[PDB]
């Protein structure tokens, strides 16, 4: 236990301001700069079809849980060196909590 529940509402707005540029979350949403995140929870990394992921993410083969995602979100390139994901990261654990709270919900 190193992830506690946040604000889905707060979560949804962070997504909009920090993730939307590159990703969609809805089932049936298109891949953009980053892949569509529908159903990411429980899936391994690099497995969405029709998306050209880097060697690195695929090979990293991470099982996406609220906790994994948390460390990833902190500093992506640090987590998976070689990832084409160009996001500095979210240093506050509270932003991270709210975003994942949103994500758990909207990608289901
Ligand atoms: C564009 C400038 C991006 C922003 C802002 C965010 N992400 Fe991203 N993401 C992007 C790319 C190009 C990729 C693929 C990387 C690669 O090496 O192929 C990713 C990947 C992800 C993943 C891993 C997905 C998988 O299918 O395993 C996740 C979980 C993810 N991105 C989430 C995410 C969130 C929540 C963001 C906002 C905080 C976000 N990313 C920003 C491009 C971009």
mmCIF file of N, CA and C and ligand atoms in Angstrom:
data_model
loop_
_atom_site.group_PDB
_atom_site.id
_atom_site.type_symbol
_atom_site.label_atom_id
_atom_site.label_comp_id
_atom_site.label_asym_id
_atom_site.label_seq_id
_atom_site.Cartn_x
_atom_site.Cartn_y
_atom_site.Cartn_z
ATOM 1 N N UNK A 1 0.884 -1.197 0.000
ATOM 2 C CA UNK A 1 0.000 0.000 0.000
ATOM 3 C C UNK A 1 0.911 1.233 0.000
ATOM 4 N N UNK A 2 0.821 1.938 -1.134
ATOM 5 C CA UNK A 2 1.676 3.142 -1.342
ATOM 6 C C UNK A 2 1.075 4.032 -2.429
ATOM 7 N N UNK A 3 -0.234 3.946 -2.531
ATOM 8 C CA UNK A 3 -1.183 4.587 -3.399
ATOM 9 C C UNK A 3 -2.568 4.573 -2.656
ATOM 10 N N UNK A 4 -3.082 5.724 -2.338
ATOM 11 C CA UNK A 4 -4.401 5.837 -1.717
ATOM 12 C C UNK A 4 -5.227 6.679 -2.689
ATOM 13 N N UNK A 5 -6.501 6.532 -2.655
ATOM 14 C CA UNK A 5 -7.517 7.182 -3.436
ATOM 15 C C UNK A 5 -7.606 8.701 -3.296
ATOM 16 N N UNK A 6 -7.780 9.306 -4.473
ATOM 17 C CA UNK A 6 -7.882 10.744 -4.629
ATOM 18 C C UNK A 6 -9.205 11.212 -5.179
ATOM 19 N N UNK A 7 -9.098 12.395 -5.802
ATOM 20 C CA UNK A 7 -10.209 13.056 -6.424
ATOM 21 C C UNK A 7 -10.284 12.663 -7.904
ATOM 22 N N UNK A 8 -11.401 12.013 -8.270
ATOM 23 C CA UNK A 8 -11.607 11.656 -9.675
ATOM 24 C C UNK A 8 -11.848 12.945 -10.468
ATOM 25 N N UNK A 9 -12.545 13.862 -9.895
ATOM 26 C CA UNK A 9 -12.884 15.179 -10.477
ATOM 27 C C UNK A 9 -11.588 15.939 -10.730
ATOM 28 N N UNK A 10 -10.757 16.042 -9.711
ATOM 29 C CA UNK A 10 -9.419 16.691 -9.791
ATOM 30 C C UNK A 10 -8.556 15.964 -10.825
ATOM 31 N N UNK A 11 -8.714 14.645 -10.772
ATOM 32 C CA UNK A 11 -8.071 13.656 -11.635
ATOM 33 C C UNK A 11 -8.349 13.875 -13.113
ATOM 34 N N UNK A 12 -9.570 14.078 -13.469
ATOM 35 C CA UNK A 12 -10.093 14.295 -14.788
ATOM 36 C C UNK A 12 -9.598 15.558 -15.457
ATOM 37 N N UNK A 13 -9.297 16.584 -14.689
ATOM 38 C CA UNK A 13 -8.822 17.902 -15.079
ATOM 39 C C UNK A 13 -7.329 17.972 -15.295
ATOM 40 N N UNK A 14 -6.619 17.119 -14.597
ATOM 41 C CA UNK A 14 -5.149 16.975 -14.704
ATOM 42 C C UNK A 14 -4.918 16.287 -16.046
ATOM 43 N N UNK A 15 -5.756 15.276 -16.246
ATOM 44 C CA UNK A 15 -5.705 14.488 -17.485
ATOM 45 C C UNK A 15 -5.812 15.441 -18.702
ATOM 46 N N UNK A 16 -6.837 16.269 -18.625
ATOM 47 C CA UNK A 16 -7.148 17.261 -19.643
ATOM 48 C C UNK A 16 -5.992 18.207 -19.855
ATOM 49 N N UNK A 17 -5.405 18.770 -18.852
ATOM 50 C CA UNK A 17 -4.257 19.665 -18.938
ATOM 51 C C UNK A 17 -2.937 18.996 -19.110
ATOM 52 N N UNK A 18 -2.660 17.773 -18.751
ATOM 53 C CA UNK A 18 -1.358 17.111 -18.861
ATOM 54 C C UNK A 18 -1.255 15.843 -19.662
ATOM 55 N N UNK A 19 -2.372 15.268 -20.056
ATOM 56 C CA UNK A 19 -2.276 14.022 -20.835
ATOM 57 C C UNK A 19 -3.017 14.105 -22.152
ATOM 58 N N UNK A 20 -4.041 14.861 -22.307
ATOM 59 C CA UNK A 20 -4.938 14.960 -23.446
ATOM 60 C C UNK A 20 -4.300 15.255 -24.806
ATOM 61 N N UNK A 21 -3.298 16.092 -24.732
ATOM 62 C CA UNK A 21 -2.449 16.442 -25.876
ATOM 63 C C UNK A 21 -2.027 15.188 -26.626
ATOM 64 N N UNK A 22 -1.727 14.113 -25.928
ATOM 65 C CA UNK A 22 -1.233 12.879 -26.546
ATOM 66 C C UNK A 22 -2.081 11.665 -26.411
ATOM 67 N N UNK A 23 -3.033 11.655 -25.485
ATOM 68 C CA UNK A 23 -3.865 10.414 -25.284
ATOM 69 C C UNK A 23 -5.364 10.635 -25.116
ATOM 70 N N UNK A 24 -6.084 9.521 -25.428
ATOM 71 C CA UNK A 24 -7.552 9.477 -25.267
ATOM 72 C C UNK A 24 -7.841 8.388 -24.257
ATOM 73 N N UNK A 25 -9.019 8.336 -23.604
ATOM 74 C CA UNK A 25 -9.135 7.227 -22.614
ATOM 75 C C UNK A 25 -10.361 6.308 -22.917
ATOM 76 N N UNK A 26 -11.182 6.836 -23.777
ATOM 77 C CA UNK A 26 -12.449 6.150 -24.101
ATOM 78 C C UNK A 26 -12.278 4.941 -24.978
ATOM 79 N N UNK A 27 -13.131 3.950 -24.763
ATOM 80 C CA UNK A 27 -13.157 2.689 -25.514
ATOM 81 C C UNK A 27 -13.523 3.047 -26.936
ATOM 82 N N UNK A 28 -12.610 2.799 -27.892
ATOM 83 C CA UNK A 28 -13.100 3.271 -29.263
ATOM 84 C C UNK A 28 -12.560 4.616 -29.640
ATOM 85 N N UNK A 29 -11.743 5.174 -28.803
ATOM 86 C CA UNK A 29 -10.975 6.443 -28.953
ATOM 87 C C UNK A 29 -9.713 6.042 -29.772
ATOM 88 N N UNK A 30 -9.302 6.994 -30.552
ATOM 89 C CA UNK A 30 -8.117 6.807 -31.349
ATOM 90 C C UNK A 30 -6.792 6.963 -30.618
ATOM 91 N N UNK A 31 -5.788 6.348 -31.250
ATOM 92 C CA UNK A 31 -4.401 6.492 -30.831
ATOM 93 C C UNK A 31 -3.973 7.864 -31.385
ATOM 94 N N UNK A 32 -3.208 8.657 -30.647
ATOM 95 C CA UNK A 32 -2.728 9.965 -31.188
ATOM 96 C C UNK A 32 -1.194 9.889 -31.138
ATOM 97 N N UNK A 33 -0.578 10.906 -30.457
ATOM 98 C CA UNK A 33 0.843 10.859 -30.180
ATOM 99 C C UNK A 33 1.120 9.594 -29.303
ATOM 100 N N UNK A 34 0.363 9.469 -28.236
ATOM 101 C CA UNK A 34 0.489 8.292 -27.364
ATOM 102 C C UNK A 34 -0.732 7.398 -27.700
ATOM 103 N N UNK A 35 -0.707 6.137 -27.280
ATOM 104 C CA UNK A 35 -1.781 5.194 -27.600
ATOM 105 C C UNK A 35 -3.051 5.510 -26.825
ATOM 106 N N UNK A 36 -4.130 4.867 -27.260
ATOM 107 C CA UNK A 36 -5.424 5.027 -26.533
ATOM 108 C C UNK A 36 -5.267 4.299 -25.202
ATOM 109 N N UNK A 37 -5.705 4.837 -24.041
ATOM 110 C CA UNK A 37 -5.448 4.101 -22.779
ATOM 111 C C UNK A 37 -6.603 3.262 -22.312
ATOM 112 N N UNK A 38 -7.671 3.132 -23.031
ATOM 113 C CA UNK A 38 -8.798 2.252 -22.616
ATOM 114 C C UNK A 38 -8.221 0.867 -22.257
ATOM 115 N N UNK A 39 -8.742 0.397 -21.110
ATOM 116 C CA UNK A 39 -8.376 -0.893 -20.550
ATOM 117 C C UNK A 39 -6.901 -0.993 -20.181
ATOM 118 N N UNK A 40 -6.090 0.025 -19.995
ATOM 119 C CA UNK A 40 -4.694 -0.171 -19.581
ATOM 120 C C UNK A 40 -4.452 -0.928 -18.309
ATOM 121 N N UNK A 41 -5.396 -0.757 -17.349
ATOM 122 C CA UNK A 41 -5.179 -1.421 -16.044
ATOM 123 C C UNK A 41 -5.197 -2.923 -16.229
ATOM 124 N N UNK A 42 -4.132 -3.566 -15.758
ATOM 125 C CA UNK A 42 -3.929 -5.002 -15.858
ATOM 126 C C UNK A 42 -3.225 -5.510 -17.072
ATOM 127 N N UNK A 43 -3.165 -4.768 -18.131
ATOM 128 C CA UNK A 43 -2.469 -5.082 -19.376
ATOM 129 C C UNK A 43 -0.960 -4.853 -19.168
ATOM 130 N N UNK A 44 -0.130 -5.494 -20.000
ATOM 131 C CA UNK A 44 1.340 -5.224 -19.892
ATOM 132 C C UNK A 44 1.543 -3.996 -20.809
ATOM 133 N N UNK A 45 2.691 -3.435 -20.777
ATOM 134 C CA UNK A 45 3.152 -2.312 -21.578
ATOM 135 C C UNK A 45 3.511 -2.767 -23.021
ATOM 136 N N UNK A 46 3.184 -1.932 -23.935
ATOM 137 C CA UNK A 46 3.362 -2.013 -25.359
ATOM 138 C C UNK A 46 2.424 -3.024 -26.019
ATOM 139 N N UNK A 47 1.134 -3.089 -25.747
ATOM 140 C CA UNK A 47 0.308 -4.145 -26.374
ATOM 141 C C UNK A 47 -0.962 -3.755 -27.048
ATOM 142 N N UNK A 48 -1.167 -2.453 -27.116
ATOM 143 C CA UNK A 48 -2.353 -1.895 -27.784
ATOM 144 C C UNK A 48 -2.170 -2.209 -29.276
ATOM 145 N N UNK A 49 -3.286 -2.607 -29.970
ATOM 146 C CA UNK A 49 -2.879 -2.798 -31.402
ATOM 147 C C UNK A 49 -2.972 -1.528 -32.209
ATOM 148 N N UNK A 50 -2.102 -1.529 -33.276
ATOM 149 C CA UNK A 50 -2.094 -0.382 -34.213
ATOM 150 C C UNK A 50 -1.244 0.746 -33.710
ATOM 151 N N UNK A 51 -0.499 0.506 -32.666
ATOM 152 C CA UNK A 51 0.423 1.517 -32.115
ATOM 153 C C UNK A 51 1.877 1.027 -32.201
ATOM 154 N N UNK A 52 2.651 1.995 -32.686
ATOM 155 C CA UNK A 52 4.083 1.815 -32.872
ATOM 156 C C UNK A 52 4.831 2.199 -31.628
ATOM 157 N N UNK A 53 4.942 1.308 -30.648
ATOM 158 C CA UNK A 53 5.683 1.623 -29.386
ATOM 159 C C UNK A 53 7.203 1.436 -29.598
ATOM 160 N N UNK A 54 8.057 1.989 -28.803
ATOM 161 C CA UNK A 54 9.492 1.940 -28.798
ATOM 162 C C UNK A 54 9.861 0.503 -28.337
ATOM 163 N N UNK A 55 11.090 0.089 -28.615
ATOM 164 C CA UNK A 55 11.544 -1.269 -28.248
ATOM 165 C C UNK A 55 11.445 -1.452 -26.714
ATOM 166 N N UNK A 56 11.902 -0.426 -26.055
ATOM 167 C CA UNK A 56 12.061 -0.161 -24.641
ATOM 168 C C UNK A 56 10.854 -0.409 -23.748
ATOM 169 N N UNK A 57 9.718 0.166 -24.190
ATOM 170 C CA UNK A 57 8.496 -0.051 -23.421
ATOM 171 C C UNK A 57 8.016 -1.485 -23.519
ATOM 172 N N UNK A 58 8.071 -2.019 -24.689
ATOM 173 C CA UNK A 58 7.636 -3.390 -24.943
ATOM 174 C C UNK A 58 8.377 -4.418 -24.070
ATOM 175 N N UNK A 59 9.662 -4.193 -24.093
ATOM 176 C CA UNK A 59 10.676 -5.029 -23.467
ATOM 177 C C UNK A 59 10.648 -4.918 -21.960
ATOM 178 N N UNK A 60 10.204 -3.756 -21.534
ATOM 179 C CA UNK A 60 10.086 -3.394 -20.119
ATOM 180 C C UNK A 60 8.989 -4.261 -19.524
ATOM 181 N N UNK A 61 8.018 -4.587 -20.310
ATOM 182 C CA UNK A 61 6.888 -5.428 -19.990
ATOM 183 C C UNK A 61 6.391 -5.332 -18.533
ATOM 184 N N UNK A 62 5.829 -4.193 -18.234
ATOM 185 C CA UNK A 62 5.245 -3.703 -17.010
ATOM 186 C C UNK A 62 3.740 -4.081 -17.073
ATOM 187 N N UNK A 63 3.332 -4.514 -15.877
ATOM 188 C CA UNK A 63 1.906 -4.855 -15.649
ATOM 189 C C UNK A 63 1.382 -3.590 -14.935
ATOM 190 N N UNK A 64 0.414 -2.936 -15.600
ATOM 191 C CA UNK A 64 -0.146 -1.661 -15.207
ATOM 192 C C UNK A 64 -1.195 -1.812 -14.106
ATOM 193 N N UNK A 65 -0.743 -1.368 -12.948
ATOM 194 C CA UNK A 65 -1.533 -1.340 -11.681
ATOM 195 C C UNK A 65 -1.432 0.133 -11.242
ATOM 196 N N UNK A 66 -2.236 0.569 -10.336
ATOM 197 C CA UNK A 66 -2.258 1.918 -9.788
ATOM 198 C C UNK A 66 -0.925 2.279 -9.181
ATOM 199 N N UNK A 67 -0.158 1.323 -8.737
ATOM 200 C CA UNK A 67 1.144 1.514 -8.105
ATOM 201 C C UNK A 67 2.375 1.685 -8.989
ATOM 202 N N UNK A 68 2.405 1.035 -10.089
ATOM 203 C CA UNK A 68 3.388 0.957 -11.189
ATOM 204 C C UNK A 68 3.407 2.268 -11.990
ATOM 205 N N UNK A 69 2.183 2.565 -12.309
ATOM 206 C CA UNK A 69 1.651 3.748 -12.998
ATOM 207 C C UNK A 69 2.102 4.973 -12.207
ATOM 208 N N UNK A 70 2.059 4.810 -10.889
ATOM 209 C CA UNK A 70 2.450 5.923 -9.976
ATOM 210 C C UNK A 70 3.924 6.287 -10.109
ATOM 211 N N UNK A 71 4.771 5.228 -10.045
ATOM 212 C CA UNK A 71 6.184 5.412 -10.204
ATOM 213 C C UNK A 71 6.408 5.888 -11.637
ATOM 214 N N UNK A 72 5.683 5.266 -12.578
ATOM 215 C CA UNK A 72 5.930 5.722 -13.969
ATOM 216 C C UNK A 72 5.718 7.225 -14.136
ATOM 217 N N UNK A 73 4.568 7.650 -13.607
ATOM 218 C CA UNK A 73 4.119 9.026 -13.705
ATOM 219 C C UNK A 73 5.036 10.024 -13.103
ATOM 220 N N UNK A 74 5.794 9.604 -12.125
ATOM 221 C CA UNK A 74 6.774 10.401 -11.458
ATOM 222 C C UNK A 74 7.860 10.931 -12.391
ATOM 223 N N UNK A 75 8.360 10.090 -13.246
ATOM 224 C CA UNK A 75 9.451 10.278 -14.152
ATOM 225 C C UNK A 75 9.566 9.025 -15.040
ATOM 226 N N UNK A 76 8.836 9.186 -16.139
ATOM 227 C CA UNK A 76 8.740 8.164 -17.217
ATOM 228 C C UNK A 76 10.049 7.677 -17.812
ATOM 229 N N UNK A 77 10.894 8.526 -18.344
ATOM 230 C CA UNK A 77 12.204 8.142 -18.922
ATOM 231 C C UNK A 77 13.090 7.501 -17.852
ATOM 232 N N UNK A 78 12.967 8.009 -16.609
ATOM 233 C CA UNK A 78 13.720 7.448 -15.489
ATOM 234 C C UNK A 78 13.205 5.986 -15.378
ATOM 235 N N UNK A 79 11.945 5.762 -15.265
ATOM 236 C CA UNK A 79 11.325 4.433 -15.161
ATOM 237 C C UNK A 79 11.590 3.415 -16.277
ATOM 238 N N UNK A 80 11.428 3.852 -17.496
ATOM 239 C CA UNK A 80 11.656 3.077 -18.739
ATOM 240 C C UNK A 80 12.580 3.869 -19.655
ATOM 241 N N UNK A 81 13.897 3.882 -19.394
ATOM 242 C CA UNK A 81 14.825 4.598 -20.229
ATOM 243 C C UNK A 81 14.581 4.163 -21.693
ATOM 244 N N UNK A 82 14.499 5.130 -22.571
ATOM 245 C CA UNK A 82 14.280 4.865 -23.999
ATOM 246 C C UNK A 82 12.846 5.062 -24.472
ATOM 247 N N UNK A 83 11.951 5.354 -23.542
ATOM 248 C CA UNK A 83 10.549 5.621 -23.854
ATOM 249 C C UNK A 83 10.455 6.920 -24.647
ATOM 250 N N UNK A 84 9.662 6.895 -25.685
ATOM 251 C CA UNK A 84 9.431 8.059 -26.504
ATOM 252 C C UNK A 84 8.406 8.941 -25.760
ATOM 253 N N UNK A 85 7.909 8.563 -24.607
ATOM 254 C CA UNK A 85 6.933 9.436 -23.862
ATOM 255 C C UNK A 85 7.678 10.666 -23.380
ATOM 256 N N UNK A 86 7.451 11.778 -23.995
ATOM 257 C CA UNK A 86 8.083 13.081 -23.650
ATOM 258 C C UNK A 86 7.304 13.903 -22.591
ATOM 259 N N UNK A 87 7.113 13.405 -21.422
ATOM 260 C CA UNK A 87 6.427 14.114 -20.301
ATOM 261 C C UNK A 87 7.419 14.161 -19.152
ATOM 262 N N UNK A 88 7.709 15.322 -18.577
ATOM 263 C CA UNK A 88 8.670 15.432 -17.469
ATOM 264 C C UNK A 88 8.212 14.544 -16.316
ATOM 265 N N UNK A 89 6.949 14.741 -15.894
ATOM 266 C CA UNK A 89 6.392 13.920 -14.827
ATOM 267 C C UNK A 89 5.590 14.745 -13.829
ATOM 268 N N UNK A 90 5.044 14.047 -12.884
ATOM 269 C CA UNK A 90 4.216 14.581 -11.785
ATOM 270 C C UNK A 90 4.919 14.345 -10.426
ATOM 271 N N UNK A 91 5.588 15.346 -9.869
ATOM 272 C CA UNK A 91 6.308 15.143 -8.622
ATOM 273 C C UNK A 91 5.430 14.981 -7.361
ATOM 274 N N UNK A 92 4.278 15.630 -7.314
ATOM 275 C CA UNK A 92 3.390 15.528 -6.159
ATOM 276 C C UNK A 92 2.637 14.229 -6.144
ATOM 277 N N UNK A 93 2.784 13.488 -5.070
ATOM 278 C CA UNK A 93 2.031 12.264 -4.888
ATOM 279 C C UNK A 93 0.541 12.549 -4.924
ATOM 280 N N UNK A 94 0.047 13.641 -4.450
ATOM 281 C CA UNK A 94 -1.387 13.982 -4.441
ATOM 282 C C UNK A 94 -1.881 14.160 -5.849
ATOM 283 N N UNK A 95 -1.193 14.795 -6.787
ATOM 284 C CA UNK A 95 -1.668 14.869 -8.224
ATOM 285 C C UNK A 95 -1.802 13.512 -8.897
ATOM 286 N N UNK A 96 -0.810 12.696 -8.655
ATOM 287 C CA UNK A 96 -0.621 11.344 -9.054
ATOM 288 C C UNK A 96 -1.811 10.524 -8.544
ATOM 289 N N UNK A 97 -2.191 10.773 -7.296
ATOM 290 C CA UNK A 97 -3.302 9.976 -6.689
ATOM 291 C C UNK A 97 -4.615 10.289 -7.347
ATOM 292 N N UNK A 98 -4.821 11.623 -7.444
ATOM 293 C CA UNK A 98 -6.046 12.031 -8.164
ATOM 294 C C UNK A 98 -5.977 11.529 -9.611
ATOM 295 N N UNK A 99 -4.888 11.676 -10.377
ATOM 296 C CA UNK A 99 -4.949 11.255 -11.796
ATOM 297 C C UNK A 99 -5.283 9.771 -11.970
ATOM 298 N N UNK A 100 -4.690 8.900 -11.214
ATOM 299 C CA UNK A 100 -4.848 7.425 -11.243
ATOM 300 C C UNK A 100 -6.271 7.036 -10.793
ATOM 301 N N UNK A 101 -6.775 7.861 -9.866
ATOM 302 C CA UNK A 101 -8.139 7.696 -9.351
ATOM 303 C C UNK A 101 -9.025 7.916 -10.585
ATOM 304 N N UNK A 102 -8.734 8.943 -11.358
ATOM 305 C CA UNK A 102 -9.536 9.236 -12.571
ATOM 306 C C UNK A 102 -9.482 8.117 -13.622
ATOM 307 N N UNK A 103 -8.242 7.714 -13.846
ATOM 308 C CA UNK A 103 -7.792 6.738 -14.826
ATOM 309 C C UNK A 103 -8.405 5.371 -14.566
ATOM 310 N N UNK A 104 -8.305 4.839 -13.387
ATOM 311 C CA UNK A 104 -8.906 3.599 -12.917
ATOM 312 C C UNK A 104 -10.366 3.533 -13.356
ATOM 313 N N UNK A 105 -11.015 4.653 -13.299
ATOM 314 C CA UNK A 105 -12.422 4.884 -13.616
ATOM 315 C C UNK A 105 -12.746 5.090 -15.094
ATOM 316 N N UNK A 106 -12.045 6.061 -15.705
ATOM 317 C CA UNK A 106 -12.312 6.342 -17.144
ATOM 318 C C UNK A 106 -11.771 5.315 -18.118
ATOM 319 N N UNK A 107 -10.756 4.553 -17.818
ATOM 320 C CA UNK A 107 -10.247 3.521 -18.753
ATOM 321 C C UNK A 107 -10.869 2.131 -18.614
ATOM 322 N N UNK A 108 -11.903 1.941 -17.837
ATOM 323 C CA UNK A 108 -12.602 0.710 -17.554
ATOM 324 C C UNK A 108 -13.709 0.365 -18.526
HETATM 325 C C1 LIG B 1 2.882 13.493 -25.425
HETATM 326 C C2 LIG B 1 3.819 14.667 -25.455
HETATM 327 C C3 LIG B 1 2.559 12.664 -24.162
HETATM 328 C C4 LIG B 1 2.091 13.096 -22.985
HETATM 329 C C5 LIG B 1 1.859 14.610 -22.530
HETATM 330 C C6 LIG B 1 1.831 11.969 -22.179
HETATM 331 N N1 LIG B 1 2.138 10.817 -22.842
HETATM 332 FE FE1 LIG B 1 1.798 8.965 -22.211
HETATM 333 N N2 LIG B 1 2.743 8.233 -23.867
HETATM 334 C C7 LIG B 1 3.134 8.976 -24.947
HETATM 335 C C8 LIG B 1 3.749 8.115 -25.909
HETATM 336 C C9 LIG B 1 4.389 8.545 -27.272
HETATM 337 C C10 LIG B 1 3.743 6.878 -25.375
HETATM 338 C C11 LIG B 1 4.368 5.605 -25.986
HETATM 339 C C12 LIG B 1 5.836 5.505 -25.534
HETATM 340 C C13 LIG B 1 6.699 4.535 -26.184
HETATM 341 O O1 LIG B 1 7.863 4.373 -25.785
HETATM 342 O O2 LIG B 1 6.146 3.885 -27.128
HETATM 343 C C14 LIG B 1 3.174 6.955 -24.069
HETATM 344 C C15 LIG B 1 2.890 5.862 -23.236
HETATM 345 C C16 LIG B 1 2.060 5.888 -22.156
HETATM 346 C C17 LIG B 1 1.777 4.829 -21.282
HETATM 347 C C18 LIG B 1 2.301 3.355 -21.444
HETATM 348 C C19 LIG B 1 1.155 2.663 -22.299
HETATM 349 C C20 LIG B 1 1.130 1.251 -22.707
HETATM 350 O O3 LIG B 1 0.346 0.990 -23.643
HETATM 351 O O4 LIG B 1 1.910 0.498 -22.062
HETATM 352 C C21 LIG B 1 0.962 5.263 -20.266
HETATM 353 C C22 LIG B 1 0.441 4.386 -19.111
HETATM 354 C C23 LIG B 1 0.762 6.648 -20.494
HETATM 355 N N3 LIG B 1 1.480 7.049 -21.643
HETATM 356 C C24 LIG B 1 0.022 7.555 -19.764
HETATM 357 C C25 LIG B 1 0.075 8.905 -19.788
HETATM 358 C C26 LIG B 1 -0.556 9.814 -18.841
HETATM 359 C C27 LIG B 1 -1.478 9.323 -17.724
HETATM 360 C C28 LIG B 1 -0.209 11.066 -19.145
HETATM 361 C C29 LIG B 1 -0.565 12.352 -18.445
HETATM 362 C C30 LIG B 1 -0.126 12.428 -16.941
HETATM 363 C C31 LIG B 1 0.690 10.995 -20.300
HETATM 364 N N4 LIG B 1 0.924 9.661 -20.592
HETATM 365 C C32 LIG B 1 1.279 12.047 -20.902
HETATM 366 C C33 LIG B 1 2.928 10.365 -25.097
HETATM 367 C C34 LIG B 1 2.550 11.211 -24.103
#
